[PDB]
Amino acid sequence: GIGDPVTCLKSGAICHPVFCPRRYKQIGTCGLPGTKCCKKP
């Protein structure tokens, strides 16, 4: 659940590799890549 490559979008999480700026956080992905999805912490 919340915290995946797909569901990541389900939470409107942003797509950012390496890390994610801003007071945001999630620890998700984007797609097949180990992208770093960020969402409202």
Swiss-Prot record:
The keyword Isomerase does not apply. Changing residue 25 to A: Loss of PIP2 binding and reduced liposomal lysis activity. Impaired antifungal activity. Decrease in fungal cell permeabilization. Induction: Up-regulated by TNF, IL1B, Gram-negative and Gram-positive bacteria, C.albicans and bacterial lipopolysaccharides (LPS). Up-regulated by inflammation in skin keratinocytes in epidermal tissue. The keyword Secreted applies. Disulfide bonds join 8-37, 15-30, 20-38. Monomer. Homodimer. Belongs to the beta-defensin family. LAP/TAP subfamily. This is Defensin beta 4A. It comes from Homo sapiens (Human). The lineage of its organism: Eukaryota, Metazoa, Chordata, Craniata, Vertebrata.
